[PDB]
Amino acid sequence: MARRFFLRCIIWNTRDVILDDLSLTGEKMSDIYVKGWMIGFEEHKQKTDVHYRSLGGEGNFNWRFIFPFDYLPAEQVCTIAKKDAFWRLDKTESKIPARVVFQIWDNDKFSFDDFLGSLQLDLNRMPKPAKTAKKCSLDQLDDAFHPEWFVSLFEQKTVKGWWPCVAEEGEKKILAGKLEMTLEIVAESEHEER
């Protein structure tokens, strides 16, 4: 059966975010905000408020996202279709991995917002978070050589800490920002804590 879950995301802060603009005084800065959504549920995407005029790449948000999604425990696969009748968005089935996306953006008033970097996470196999922003690095993404550093959120239920965001210089990967988050998968009915 398809079971209804909820991904609860708190965006606490960002650090080291790329600075995309020049100030009227001529100082590098970004008007930072964070976009999030689950793949296959692009209709429910959400964003934080904007941390205006970040001069050192830091932003403060303390923002809560809730992402509802359907899940097949036995298949460990997302059903991009919501629930019940065809009236639901994404019709029926389509089985894909459960993944959430976080994107860091610079808000502009007099042009379009500019993409700064993103992080895409597999809820079944995701990199462990760094305790501090200092220990946050692209090494966290090393699924090839340190597979023990990937884990499953469904098993752990909750993870907190820092993850890196990435921008592609063509094939090359560059640290575009660091994201401090709490991630928790929540059931419709279960014990408050285990």
Output the known binding site for Ca(2+).
108, 111, 114
Alpha helices in 18-81 (DSSP H): none
124 three-class SS: coil
Hunting for tokens 């929540």 — which residue is that? Answer: 186
Q: Which residue lies nearer to Cl ion by CB, 104 or 136?
A: 104
145 near Cl ion (CB under 5 A): no
The footprint of Ca ion (CB under 5 A) covers 20-21, 31, 106, 108, 111, 114
80-88 — which CB contacts under 8 Å span 24+ positions?
A: 80/39, 80/40, 80/41, 83/2, 83/4
* Residue 109 interacts with, from Cl ion, Ca ion, none (CB under 5-8 Å by kind): Cl ion
109 near Cl ion (CB under 5 A): yes
108 near Cl ion (CB under 5 A): yes
Q: Judge whether 163 and 129 are in contact, CB under 8 Å.
A: yes
Give the residue at shortest CB distance from Ca ion: 111
87 near Cl ion (CB under 5 A): no
Residue 105 CB coordination number (10 Å): 23
23 near Cl ion (CB under 5 A): no
* Residue 42 interacts with, from Ca ion, Cl ion, none (CB under 5-8 Å by kind): none
Q: Which residue lies nearer to Cl ion by CB, 87 or 110?
A: 110
Q: How far apart are CA 164 and CA 14, in angstroms?
A: 10
Return residues touching Cl ion (CB under 5 A).
Answer: 108-110
